[PDB]
Amino acid sequence: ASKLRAVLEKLKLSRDDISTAAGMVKGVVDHLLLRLKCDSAFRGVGLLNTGSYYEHPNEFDVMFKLEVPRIQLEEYSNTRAYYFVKFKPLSQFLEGEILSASKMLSKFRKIIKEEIPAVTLLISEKISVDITLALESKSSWPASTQEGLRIQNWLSAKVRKQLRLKPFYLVPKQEETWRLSFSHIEKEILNNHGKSKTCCENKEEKCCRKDCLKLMKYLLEQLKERFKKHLDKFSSYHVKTAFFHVCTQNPQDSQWDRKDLGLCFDNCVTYFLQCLRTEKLENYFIPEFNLFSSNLIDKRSKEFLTKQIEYERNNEFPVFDE
Ligand SMILES: [Zn+2]
């Protein structure tokens, strides 16, 4: 549809500005990586490479991963996503048997501080980088994910098995808990997203999946930008999660034809609206973890965002107007 394509054209205008800043961040990040490598605790550290930039302007997100030897997890309450970690030289942060996140974060923060979720939010001039520490575990994924990643009918059972052989990550968050992270898998599915292995590799198989995700993120950004903080709790992660569920529901590449961009976008919006109304948005990897629970976002805010998105959809997205 013309309006949506005009919006996608407008977003392209900002590409080089994002590009150039990325190389400035990358220079600083490359610089911290080497100094973190000197410290005993962080000697194995490396760059995970994930998030918006890696997937397809002043804000950037970077994850530092650290290989931790044979890990053992303990689920904080019945949270599904939060854990204490223990083992089957990081013993300096051991609270007896349990790895202290705030001990690890304090030194991690101090080293970067010396050099100059999120751990560090740091600055080169008008560049905000969030830097996150992630423990890497090459073990089987925890049981809370056993019913997650429901890609079998879309990306295939074989791909699901291959993805679950990859490591998983833990990011520091009733204190001292770590949360599961699969940002590496999120990037892999967005960049290898078709039922056809050649989806978006030639002119006959251009789908509109990525453009739909971009449009959904831009929709939420624009609605937030209009308010000085009713929508503070909503993030691009909610939009991305909802988008993954919509790919599951529409597994065929022929359901994402570029010429059907308007209909595909409507699908994404209508699903996100359903999530708002039912107050349920399951983490794509951890189904019992409800991103839209009342513990996380009050009923009123969810109700409020429902009204605006409903208004936008019923009037052809005036927020996207010239
Ligand atoms: Zn494609």
Residue numbers in the entry: 162 to 217, 223 to 254, 261 to 288, 306 to 362, 371 to 425, 428 to 521
Mind quoting what the paper says about this structure?
To address the mechanism of immune activation by cGAS, we expressed, purified, and crystallized human cGAS (residues 161–522), including the active site and the double-stranded DNA (dsDNA) binding region. The crystals diffracted to 1.95 Å resolution and belonged to the orthorhombic space group P2 12 12, with unit-cell dimensions a = 123.5, b = 48.31, and c = 59.57 Å. The catalytic Glu225, Asp227, and Asp319 residues are located on the centrally-twisted β sheets. Despite our high resolution structure, electron densities were not observed for the regions between β1 and β2, and between α2 and β7 near the catalytic pocket, indicating their structural flexibility. A zinc ion is coordinated by the side chains of His390, Cys396, Cys397 and Cys404, and forms a protruding loop structure. In our structure, Leu174 is oriented toward the solvent, as seen in the mouse and porcine apo structures, and the catalytic pocket is partially disordered. These observations suggested that a similar structural change would occur in human cGAS upon DNA binding for catalytic activation. The concave DNA binding cleft of human cGAS is composed of a positively charged cluster of lysine and arginine residues, mainly from α1, α4, and α5. In contrast, the ZnF in the human structure forms a partial helix with Lys400 (equivalent to Ser388 and Asp377 in the mouse and porcine proteins, respectively), which is exposed towards the solvent, suggesting an additional interaction between the ZnF of human cGAS and dsDNA. Our structure of the human cGAS apo form resembles those of the mouse (69% sequence identity, r.m.s. deviation = 1.40 Å for 315 Cα atoms) and porcine (74% sequence identity, r.m.s. deviation = 1.11 Å for 312 Cα atoms) apo proteins.
